[PDB]
């Protein structure tokens, strides 16, 4: 019997025509304004027409499927992609595991940190799917940022970029660690999310040559409601104002692929700020389908299966 690997991710439009139904799914049934759509289309057209996230996510899931199976002869994993706001939806993927006869599955979200607005939404949807059909049994991974190979991978990348900065200027360099912002209300109820990213920033900092680091947030929502701060653009200005850093190294470690939230929020917005103040901009490559990142996920999944009992 095969074991299902439910790999979950946010989803990205495949075509310009998908944008509206995508935006509406994101807005939970509320249809965006025609101008709103326009702006989103403009964003996607800034980064090069559409996001590579669709092909990256597939490489990541079928790369992990392959990596798990090539490293053992006890089980055969079958990977099923379940996106959040576009097809193949989470529910489509569970329905497929049922049809194919999967009895047990291990679900993983391509987002190392847990939050009530992200990972918890994925897992509730997949398990509500699994219960209506009566199969497969889904054993969910909730977070994997504490994985040593995960921390070492980012530290190695940051150190690669750092060595390419003049040593006389490395003391004027700062590492910005960030993730998707969320409505600050999550802290009222003890969400581990903000604390998990502080741990990720600390774990990495100890393993890099960059002498300074700060935690930031990106893609904050327009809701009048407060959101987790500071924003990476405001933090860059605040940091340059107090310390006059020459180099800014951005690591959006809450993400695992070069998609819109990285290519826009960092590679364009943060870069604008550094140019305005006169600082340099650095952004290490994201994990994407790199064999090291796939080995991180293979170890994450092979440990969940070992401790499944
Ligand atoms: C926690 C989190 C992650 C990380 C974990 C995970 O991966 O799940 C993430 C990832 C991503 N978010 C993405 C894109 C978008 N997120 C939006 C809107 C929102 N995201 C939110 C949360 C998150 N999002 C929230 C609270 C909203 C508010 C919507 C509402 O009003 O209820 C919107 C709408 C317009 C806008 O405001 O930007 C878009 C287009 C893409 C795809 C990029 C591409 O296509 O390449 C990716 C990987």
Residue numbers in the entry: 3 to 311
From the primary publication:
The structures of LmCpfC wild‐type (WT) and of the R45L variant were solved in complex with the natural substrate cpIII. The R45L variant was investigated since, lacking the H‐bonding with the propionate at position 6 (p6), highlights the importance of this propionate interaction in LmCpfC. Diffraction data for LmCpfC wild‐type and for the R45L variant were collected to 1.51 Å and 2.64 Å resolution, respectively. 11 When bound to the enzyme, cpIII is distorted leading to a distinctly non‐planar geometry in both the wild‐type protein and the R45L variant. Some uncertainty remains on the detailed orientation of the carboxyl groups of the more flexible propionate p6 and p7 in the structure of cpIII‐LmCpfC R45L, due to weak electron densities. Nevertheless, the spatial orientation of the propionates towards the respective H‐bonding partners can be identified also in the R45L variant. The cpIII‐R45L (LmCpfC) crystal structure shows that, in the absence of the R45‐p6 H‐bond, the R29‐p7 H‐bond length changes from 2.9 Å in the WT to 5.9 Å in the R45L mutant. The similarity between the spectra of R29L and R45L can be rationalized considering the concomitant destabilizing effect on the R29‐p7 interaction by the R45L mutation, where the H‐bond with p6 has been eliminated. In solution the loss of the p6‐R45 H‐bond causes a dramatic weakening of the whole H‐bond network, since in addition to the rupture of the H‐bond between p7 and R29, it also makes the H‐bond between p2 and Y124 much weaker, as compared to the WT (downshift of the 403 cm−1 mode in the WT to 393 cm−1 in the mutant). The crystallographic data suggest that p6 and p7 are coupled, and the RR in solution clearly indicate that an overall readjustment of the propionate H‐bonds occurs as well in both R45L and R29L variants.
Coproporphyrin ferrochelatases (CpfCs) are enzymes catalyzing the penultimate step in the coproporphyrin‐dependent (CPD) heme biosynthesis pathway, which is mainly utilized by monoderm bacteria. Here Fe2+ ion is incorporated into coproporphyrin III (cpIII) to give Fe3+‐coproheme, which is afterwards decarboxylated by the coproheme decarboxylase enzyme, finally yielding protoheme. A cleft, build by structural elements of both ferredoxin‐like domains, contains several conserved amino acid residues (distal H182 and E263; proximal Y12) and is the porphyrin binding site, where catalysis happens, as already shown for CpfC from Bacillus subtilis. Here, we present the first crystallographic structure of the CpfC from the representative monoderm pathogen Listeria monocytogenes bound to its physiological substrate, cpIII, together with the in‐solution data obtained by resonance Raman and UV–vis spectroscopy, for wild‐type ferrochelatase and variants, analyzing propionate interactions.
